[PDB]
Ligand binder design. Structure first.
Ligand code: HEC
Ligand code: HEC
Ligand code: HEC
Ligand code: HEC
Ligand code: HEC
Ligand code: HEC
Ligand SMILES: *C(=O)CCCCCCCCC
Ligand code: SF4
Ligand code: F3S
Lengths: 408, 949, 162, 190
């Protein structure tokens, strides 16, 4: 993948399958797809916290890994697609020799720079702070002088004390409070790249909450597949139970129905509206050269979350593993369809065209997938996958020993 | 990197006429045997750049697109830099001695000497040729045309007495009846654009309507009000039917009843418009041409006159045939030719070559070692127009001079200089011209003639006479050849003949009708396509593919042609075929593209009987435009009829969009949450298209790509629909024969079961639809969506009202190509400047002189856009500020070449706050109209209305 | 690091050097090494007429006799004729005086006369101002054909004050 | 290092040759170019040697006399019989002021229209033995000198519609940059 990136940066964007009509496709498509994935961890560790959801304690740590290794993937596309990326530093409002030449502050592309760079920055210190009592439990093993040194450096001087824990708890409460607003506002700023346009099929007001609901939906679908294989490879199935799996399935079901409502909302309004251009855009999606993208997208998003109403399907690690994978396919098309079907058909029939990607568009995407797994796979062999400070506060409150004691 | 060292070289001896940084203009003319014009050459400190039009009281022949792109032939590195003799590089003294000694031998033996040329309308060149003949006892001078018109010449000669063409004035007639005319094309050196367009403007309740009868489909058909598909066997009968009505006569015309239903109507109307009508026809038969003369005399119309005949076409298909025969039959000595290319243009060139094998001392003058330069004795290196001296008489009453603008690049020698040296006349052709200039110029010699470019000469009408036209009518009506499928050969606006075989601007320039580039093709109607199973299709990458086909004729065939199924293209039973692409000598394989078809021009006839068969494979096309039809979007091209224009209020034909307020309606332009900026003082600009004057707007494209240094992209990278053009001409067909028929199917619609089928049928254009053109460029908006989203702030607006595009902060995050709803914004993808993937004129060192130094050349990743003419209007304000004046009325209009180079008065540029300009009188009109007012973007370019009837 | 006897370093010179042909630089393809190729002899551009009197001793006094000023009274009384004398003429001839200048004080080269000594008409300035009389040069390279007549009216006003 | 040792100090500073004489194209064209070798002869037909009170501690008389002869080899002048020969070679000067070719600066409407003194853009040129670039030309010196200057509206009749207006309405005089519109990305580099 790196080879493909270098090639297209050094030889030209024209090596991609982009058109004079369709300026965006697969580059920003994959950008927003990775961004959507990287909201799962910030929900699990902040929203479930705010709603006192005890079961999150066995997930939080791996959920954080999911965002720090996916936001990073997304961060490549804002640079790679640029025409002259070595001049990217001009995006920042830095005093200079051009008569203090500045940037404007009206474009959502700039808003996105602030949204993504601060989203990542804040989440990095959040999950890192939570590692202090877990690295402490590894430096105290010190099986080799090398590892001894490593964990004595990775951990700070965290001698767990009354006062230290008191402050620790308060910090995590504050950051969770700040994190939920970031989850919403960051994806909303991304959403406004299309909502603020003049293009029929893009201009709307539903996107700011709509894309967010989709982000939750696709994010949890991803997380659920890794937890399913994790609990067998790492042998941590005593911590990741069927109740954790079932609850993940329930949440996915809920947000799936929200997305469904938004689909019928757009169709109603399109009919209700007297604008021919908006109505034609929806007709193009229903019937046109990309009909298969639209209908396969709808098939996945409409029916997949509805199987969860049946307990016999919901309470099945086999069935839910498969469905969780399917959801990500449908959501990739969700992003693809909106961008492409709205550009190859618009104002002035003479400008109507098609679109087909090239091997270097495909290759870069493959590269980001490969990199994701390199980072995540290495993570699983060096980091404490389950927070000890968290689990040990619930071991007495819940578990198949103490409950039996309470019953007799 | 250290950054290079720049040096500067002043003159040892500086000439008075040259000032560094100051452009100079020269008055020259052009005539290459096919195209002709009066023009100005803008030059730099030593060299010519973009061609301008000469309008000093002789603005009769403006330059076309082919002429505008002709500058590339000057700076073509693939030119014969040195003359050759017997295949080897030689001196001109060797050439001179060879020719002189062969002439001496021909005289001694009593042989044949023949000079070949093409329509040298030149008093002094013709005189010089006459002197050659006077000195040489056995010299014949013969004229050879590629595309011939000798039938028209014979008809005129035998009535009035000379071989010349009638220069019709289309602005002095109300009814135009055209039978195979194509006067807006290359018909007789078509320069009738302005004349036609002038009568298409509804100044009052008047408008000249046009009746088109034709087999093919052309621009005059698209610009017609009525169009009747008709084969050549029907057209001849229709002409006689017209004759019988205008001229009372009884000739037994055999013609289809449905055709008679329209032919009779047109003829009766033509007859009614006495002195205000015109019959024009392009039937290759002297008898048909004679009937046209008879009818126009009967009409006695203002458009018909012999006072100023056209001297441009003076060939003969009988003389040329005799020449060819004699070369093979008898013994022909030294033959010298200039600008003549029988091998490749002559259908019988195989016999011509066998004739060449029997002659001695073949001398050919050219720019390239072409197919005839190859089969010859002496390859002479000719100069390229701007490297030579001359004089041209286009019409009967005019005289003009041609100045060289650049000193000879290569080792060339003028044809006339050669004639002078063999005649024994001292000096050169320039001196010869000086000596013979006083014979015509009664005024000041050079100072008032070379300076201005032209000289006016009086003339008089030709006497007519008695002639049995009734006999001719019966001969035409008796004439009949009704068989099977036939084809008609034609020329293009981008490809007149083989003088632009390797011209990248004309190769890239897309066809104004079919919207394709870099290739030849065959035009087949859809009714025929269904019989031959031929077709075209849009593929996944956006371009076009199509089937192959074979054309078979009597004793011959082509075996591989590329058909394009143009629905109304052919009437029925006919095939269109462009002629003039298959060249192979002295050019690169990137330019060796297309089909010649001259081999099918048997006996110089454009109409041939053929058999069409389907081939095996599939061809890929570099097609520019995708969709053929207009979806019923009346908010793009608004059209109406003349009686509606005259009797109904603007609310019924030019209606603007309304928006609801407090239960009230108001013009959409009044709704605005923001505040406007003050552009009431200081030169607010606009730009004005009227759709009636838009015939094809052909030469408006090439002039805009002349300053702005837009690079040339090959067949691939345009095949993927990724080309670079700043302004474009559109092409919108219809379904069910009208544009109002594509607004009755749409407004009458049902719910979701019929609307999935009507919108899928409205992209298949029906038989014989209506055509409409529309020029689309970047109208510089005021609430511009392309502005607000640029993160690096490379775009902004001025007080004048442009859209300023900086090429510096544009770090190519490609947003602003998306929020343009008109979507005219061209990102560049590769580096087009100096790499070997693009081996066009931007690469080589000799061909980087067309590029003007005032506009920068883009590299990679930056977008470009059809800006207003900033690099001219910043100089018009400059030249009006140093003097201490106010800018004049028509001074902004003459500088911006988007408007100052179009043929008709379609494009109008200028000021608005000046209330006495040409724009301010057009903006206050009942046809005031913008594209997409419901978007609310406030454009600065407004179209009017099509007012067809 | 930046030196002063050589130009400074640059960061990605995208559009710095030229693809087109700016006027005075050096190239390779042309006839000489220059970029300022000479126009062809005998041609006439738009807005210029050739001077029809040849060089001295046969065309000098023929220009002195019958040759007039094609100006108007609106342009003579503008003050622009004085400003051209302030630039191109004080270095040898005097500003208000005649012959005193700036360079016969410094004694760099001698032999500049006054305007009382030689009788000069309004057409005899224009023949000398384009060709020079044995120690002057062609100032046609510097001034334009509209502007040599603006100088000639000012020199006649300088002789009348002497 | 120029190939000749030309001195702007003796010519423009000690002899008081006026500044527009050699550089003559500043009034009309946008390139106030290097003076051609015809201006190097009409003053130097009568000046063969230099002086005796001009050679310095660094530069001698014989250094100047053997280098003014190099001007005679470029044109073809001969000292002996006072006549042109027929052998010419131009002088390859080194250009020290450069801008990239997206900008559009024009000396003509920027010296003749706006009456700027000829030392406030290129420095005190008459006190230089060899030529030196004085200002930095980097995009924030073009803007800064437009902030603090005035357009000349007294003489030009092009400004009669604008200057007679807004003295009744808004104000007496306006700056160049933020009032006439001289800070827009299409007026300087298009
Ligand atoms: C120094 C090179 C001079 C410059 C600069 C100008 N003039 Fe001159 N001029 C100069 C000399 C040495 C002479 C006399 C030469 C001789 O052989 O006698 C002149 C002469 C004239 C004359 C008189 C001509 C005549 O026929 O008598 C005139 C009217 C004149 N010069 C005008 C003139 C103008 C208008 C100038 C500014 C463009 C100018 N001179 C400059 C030396 C020099
Ligand atoms: C002839 C006697 C001159 C006078 C009067 C002025 N200049 Fe000059 N200039 C002259 C020459 C022969 C050259 C060539 C280069 C060199 O170093 O000799 C120049 C050059 C310049 C330049 C720099 C050119 C560049 O490429 O950057 C400048 C900026 C310049 N000259 C300015 C200038 C000024 C301000 C003058 C009036 C005081 C002036 N010149 C007069 C010759 C002559
Ligand atoms: C081309 C450069 C020019 C032109 C336009 C002028 N002169 Fe000069 N000059 C020239 C050279 C190569 C030299 C010697 C090198 C140096 O730097 O001095 C000179 C020198 C002189 C001198 C002699 C200095 C002395 O007196 O010691 C004088 C006097 C002089 N130049 C005068 C002069 C005048 C009046 C000119 C007309 C404007 C002029 N120069 C132009 C070459 C060149
Ligand atoms: C006296 C005449 C002046 C005036 C008032 C200014 N300059 Fe210009 N300058 C001058 C010369 C003889 C040259 C060399 C010509 C060349 O082409 O190199 C220059 C050069 C420049 C340049 C470089 C040319 C370019 O980039 O195209 C620039 C830029 C430049 N000078 C700028 C400039 C400005 C801003 C001035 C303020 C009024 C200015 N000059 C004045 C001589 C003279
Ligand atoms: C960079 C090159 C410079 C520099 C250093 C200066 N100027 Fe300006 N200037 C420049 C451009 C590209 C333009 C054209 C802008 C336009 O057409 O609006 C100008 C223009 C002016 C003007 C207006 C002229 C007019 O009245 O039409 C004035 C006045 C002016 N410049 C003045 C000025 C002064 C005093 C400077 C300090 C020496 C100066 N300029 C520098 C580019 C550049
Ligand atoms: C809008 C933003 C503008 C404005 C209105 C002007 N400039 Fe220009 N300019 C601008 C950029 C981003 C750059 C640098 C591009 C790069 O690749 O370096 C420039 C550059 C210049 C330069 C060259 C500076 C250098 O070489 O370091 C000059 C000189 C310059 N600009 C002059 C100039 C003038 C006269 C303008 C009219 C006021 C002007 N700039 C406007 C962006 C913008
Ligand atoms: C030319 O080779 C010099 C290039 C200078 C580059 C400056 C880089 C500064 C640190 C990123
Ligand atoms: S038309 Fe397109 S390019 Fe021109 S201003 Fe409007 S949006 Fe920008
Ligand atoms: S939005 Fe801006 S960076 Fe370039 S691609 Fe368009 S001008």
């Amino acid at each position: 993948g790196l080879g493909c990136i270098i090639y297209t940066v050094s030889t030209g964007i024209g090596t991609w399958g982009l058109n004079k009509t369709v300026g965006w496709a697969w580059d920003i498509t994959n950008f927003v797809w990775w961004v959507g994935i990287g909201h799962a961890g910030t929900l699990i560790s902040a929203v479930l916290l705010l709603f006192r959801q005890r079961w999150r304690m066995a997930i939080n740590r791996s959920a954080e890994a999911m965002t720090i290794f996916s936001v990073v993937q997304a961060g490549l596309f804002p640079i790679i697609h640029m025409g002259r990326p070595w001049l990217a530093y001009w995006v920042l409002p830095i005093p200079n020799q051009f008569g203090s030449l500045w940037v404007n502050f009206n474009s959502p592309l700039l808003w996105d720079v602030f949204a993504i760079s601060t989203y990542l920055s804040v989440s990095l210190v959040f999950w890192w702070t939570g590692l202090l009592p877990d690295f402490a439990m590894l430096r105290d093993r010190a099986i080799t002088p090398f590892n001894k040194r490593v964990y004595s450096i990775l951990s700070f001087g965290w001698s767990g004390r009354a006062k230290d824990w008191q402050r620790f708890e308060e910090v995590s409460l504050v950051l969770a409070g700040l994190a939920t607003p970031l989850v919403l506002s960051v994806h909303t700023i991304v959403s406004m790249d299309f909502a603020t346009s003049v293009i029929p099929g893009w201009h709307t007001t539903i996107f700011p909450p709509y894309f967010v609901a989709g982000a939750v939906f696709s994010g949890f679908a991803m997380v659920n597949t890794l937890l399913i294989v994790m609990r067998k490879v790492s042998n941590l199935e005593a911590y990741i139970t069927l109740q954790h799996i079932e609850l993940m399935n329930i949440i996915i079901m809920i947000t799936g129905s929200i997305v469904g409502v938004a689909y019928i909302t757009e169709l109603f309004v399109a009919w209700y509206s007297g604008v021919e251009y908006e109505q034609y855009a929806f007709l193009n999606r229903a019937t046109g050269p990309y009909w298969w993208a639209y209908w396969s997208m709808m098939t996945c998003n409409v029916f997949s979350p509805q199987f969860m109403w049946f307990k016999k399907l919901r309470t099945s690690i086999m069935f839910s593993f498969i469905i969780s994978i399917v959801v990500n396919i449908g959501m990739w098309f969700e992003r693809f369809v909106i961008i492409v079907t709205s550009l190859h058909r618009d104002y002035l029939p003479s400008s109507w065209t098609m679109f087909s990607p090239t091997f270097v568009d495909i290759g870069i995407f493959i590269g980001t997938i490969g990199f994701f797994f390199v980072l995540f796979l290495l993570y699983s062999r060096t980091f404490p996958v389950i927070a000890q400070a968290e689990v040990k506060t619930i071991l007495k409150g819940t578990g198949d020993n103490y409950i039996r004691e309470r019953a007799n | 990197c250290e950054g290079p060292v720049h040096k500067s070289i002043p003159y040892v001896l500086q000439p008075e006429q040259i000032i560094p940084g100051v452009a100079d203009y020269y008055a020259t003319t052009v005539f290459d045997g096919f195209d002709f014009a009066n023009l100005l050459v803008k030059t730099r400190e030593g060299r010519p750049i973009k061609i301008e039009n000469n309008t000093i009281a002789g603005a009769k022949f403006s330059a076309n697109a082919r002429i505008h792109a002709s500058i590339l032939g000057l700076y073509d590195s693939m030119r014969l830099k040195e003359p050759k003799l017997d295949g080897k590089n030689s001196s001109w003294s060797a050439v001179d001695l060879k020719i002189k000694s062969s002439l001496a031998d021909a005289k001694a033996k009593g042989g044949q000497v023949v000079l070949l040329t093409n329509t040298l309308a030149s008093p002094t060149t013709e005189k010089l040729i006459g002197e050659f003949i006077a000195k040489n006892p056995n010299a014949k001078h013969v004229v050879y045309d590629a595309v011939s018109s000798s039938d028209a010449l014979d008809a005129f000669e035998t009535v009035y007495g000379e071989r010349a063409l009638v220069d019709y004035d289309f602005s002095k007639a109300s009814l135009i009846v055209s039978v195979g005319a194509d006067f807006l094309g290359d018909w007789q050196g078509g320069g009738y654009d302005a004349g036609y367009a002038k009568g298409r403007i509804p100044q009052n309740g008047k408008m000249s309507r046009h009746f088109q009868f034709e087999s093919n489909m052309t621009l005059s058909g698209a610009a017609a009000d009525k169009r009747v598909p008709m084969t050549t066997a029907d057209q001849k009968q229709a002409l006689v039917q017209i004759y019988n009505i205008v001229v009372g006569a009884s000739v037994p015309v055999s013609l289809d009843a449905k055709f008679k239903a329209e032919v009779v109507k047109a003829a009766q109307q033509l007859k009614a418009a006495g002195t205000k009508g015109i019959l024009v026809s392009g039937i290759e038969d002297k008898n048909a041409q004679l009937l046209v003369l008879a009818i126009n005399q009967a009409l006695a119309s203002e458009a018909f006159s012999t006072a100023g005949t056209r001297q441009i076409r003076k060939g003969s298909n009988a003389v040329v045939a005799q020449l060819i025969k004699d070369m093979n039959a008898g013994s022909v000595h030294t033959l010298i030719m200039s600008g003549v290319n029988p091998v490749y243009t002559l259908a019988d060139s195989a016999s011509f070559v066998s004739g060449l094998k029997k002659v001695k001392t073949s001398v050919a003058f050219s720019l390239k070692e072409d197919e005839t330069a190859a089969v010859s004795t002496i390859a002479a290196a000719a100069p390229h127009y701007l490297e030579s001296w001359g004089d041209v008489e286009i019409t009967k009453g005019t005289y003009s001079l041609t100045q060289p603008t650049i000193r000879p690049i290569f080792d060339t020698k003028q044809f006339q200089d050669v004639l002078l040296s063999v005649n024994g006349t001292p000096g050169n052709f320039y001196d010869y011209l000086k000596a013979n200039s006083g014979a015509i110029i009664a005024g000041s010699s050079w100072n008032k003639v070379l300076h201005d470019g032209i000289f006016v000469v009086g003339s008089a009408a030709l006497a007519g006479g008695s002639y049995d036209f009734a006999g001719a009518a019966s001969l035409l009506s008796k004439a009949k050849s009704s068989g099977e499928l036939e084809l008609v050969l034609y020329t293009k606006t981008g490809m007149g003949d083989g003088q632009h075989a390797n011209n990248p601007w004309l190769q890239e320039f897309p066809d104004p009708i079919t919207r394709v580039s870099w290739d030849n093709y065959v035009t087949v109607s859809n009714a025929d396509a269904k019989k031959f199973n031929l077709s075209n299709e849009i593929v996944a990458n956006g371009g076009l593919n199509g089937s192959y086909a074979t054309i078979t004729t009597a004793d011959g065939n082509k075996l591989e042609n590329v058909p394009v199924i143009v629905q109304p293209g052919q009437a029925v039973g006919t095939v269109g075929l462009a002629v003039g692409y298959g060249r192979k000598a002295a050019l690169k394989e990137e330019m060796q593209v297309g089909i010649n078809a001259y081999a099918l021009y048997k006996n110089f006839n454009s109409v041939q009987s053929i058999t069409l068969a389907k081939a095996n494979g599939e061809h890929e096309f570099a097609c520019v435009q995708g969709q053929k039809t207009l979806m019923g979007r009346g908010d793009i091209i608004k059209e109406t009829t003349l009686e509606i224009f005259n009797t109904q209020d603007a609310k019924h034909w030019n209606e603007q969009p309304m928006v609801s307020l407090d239960h009230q309606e108001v013009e959409a332009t009044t709704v605005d949450l923001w505040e406007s900026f003050d552009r009431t003082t200081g030169h607010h600009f606009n730009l004005s298209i009227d759709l009636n004057a838009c015939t094809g707007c052909g030469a408006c494209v090439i002039a805009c790509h002349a300053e702005n240094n837009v690079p040339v992209v090959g067949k691939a990278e345009v095949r993927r629909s990724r080309d670079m053009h700043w302004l474009r001409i559109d092409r919108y067909y219809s379904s069910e024969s009208t544009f109002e028929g594509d607004n009755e199917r749409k407004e009458g619609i049902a719910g979701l079961s019929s609307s999935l089928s009507t919108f899928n049928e409205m992209e298949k254009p029906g038989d014989n639809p209506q055509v409409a053109f529309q020029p689309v460029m970047c109208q510089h908006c005021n609430h511009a969506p392309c502005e607000t989203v640029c993160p690096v702030a490379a775009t902004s607006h001025g007080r004048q009202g442009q859209n300023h595009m900086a090429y510096n902060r544009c770090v190519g995050t490609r947003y602003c190509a998306n929020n343009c709803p008109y979507k005219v914004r061209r990102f560049n993808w590769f580096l087009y400047n100096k790499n070997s993937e693009f081996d066009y004129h931007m690469n080589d060192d000799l061909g980087r002189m067309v590029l003007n130094p005032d506009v920068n050349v883009r590299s990679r990743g930056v977008m470009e856009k059809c800006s207003f003419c900033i690099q001219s209007t910043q100089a018009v304000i400059l030249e009006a500020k140093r003097q201490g004046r106010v800018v004049g009325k028509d001074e902004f209009n003459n500088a911006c070449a988007c408007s100052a180079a179009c043929s008709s008065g379609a494009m109008v540029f200028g000021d608005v706050n000046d209330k006495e300009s040409e724009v301010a009188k057009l903006a206050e009109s009942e046809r005031m109209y913008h594209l997409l007012e419901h978007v609310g973007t406030k454009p600065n370019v407004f179209y009017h209305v099509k007012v067809r009837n | 690091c930046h030196n002063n006897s050589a130009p400074n370093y640059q960061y990605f010179p995208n559009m710095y050097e030229s693809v087109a042909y700016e006027p005075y630089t050096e190239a390779k393809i042309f006839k000489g090494g220059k970029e300022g190729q000479l126009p062809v002899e005998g041609t006439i551009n738009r807005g210029f007429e050739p001077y029809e009197y040849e060089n001295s001793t046969a065309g000098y006094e023929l220009a002195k006799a019958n040759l007039k000023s094609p100006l108007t009274e609106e342009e003579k009384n503008s003050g622009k004729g004085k400003e051209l004398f302030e630039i191109y003429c004080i270095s040898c001839h005097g500003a208000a005086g005649n012959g005193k200048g700036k360079l016969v004080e410094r004694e760099k080269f001698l032999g500049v006369p006054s305007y009382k000594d030689r009788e000069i008409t309004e057409g005899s300035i224009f023949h000398v101002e384009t060709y020079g009389l044995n120690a002057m040069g062609s100032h046609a390279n510097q001034l334009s054909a509209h502007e040599r007549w603006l100088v000639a009216d000012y020199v006649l006003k300088l002789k009348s004050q002497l | 290092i120029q190939p000749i040792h030309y001195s702007h100090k003796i010519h423009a500073g000690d002899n008081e040759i006026n500044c527009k004489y050699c550089h003559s194209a500043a009034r009309v064209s946008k390139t106030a170019g290097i003076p051609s070798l015809n201006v190097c002869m009409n003053c130097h037909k009568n000046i063969s040697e230099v002086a005796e009170t001009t050679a310095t501690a660094e530069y001698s008389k014989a250094f100047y006399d053997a280098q003014i002869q190099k001007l005679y080899d470029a044109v073809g002048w001969d000292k002996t019989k006072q006549a042109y020969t027929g052998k010419t070679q131009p002088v390859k000067w080194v250009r020290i002021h450069n801008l990239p070719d997206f900008v559009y600066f024009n000396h003509s409407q920027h010296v003749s229209v706006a009456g700027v003194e000829c030392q406030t853009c290129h420095g005190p040129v008459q006190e230089f033995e060899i030529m030196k670039q004085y200002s930095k030309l980097t995009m924030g010196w073009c803007v800064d000198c437009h902030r603090k200057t005035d357009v000349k509206m007294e003489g030009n009749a092009y400004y009669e519609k604008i200057h007679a207006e807004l003295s009744k309405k808004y104000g007496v005089e306006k700056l160049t940059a933020a009032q006439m519109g001289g800070l827009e990305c299409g007026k300087c580099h298009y």
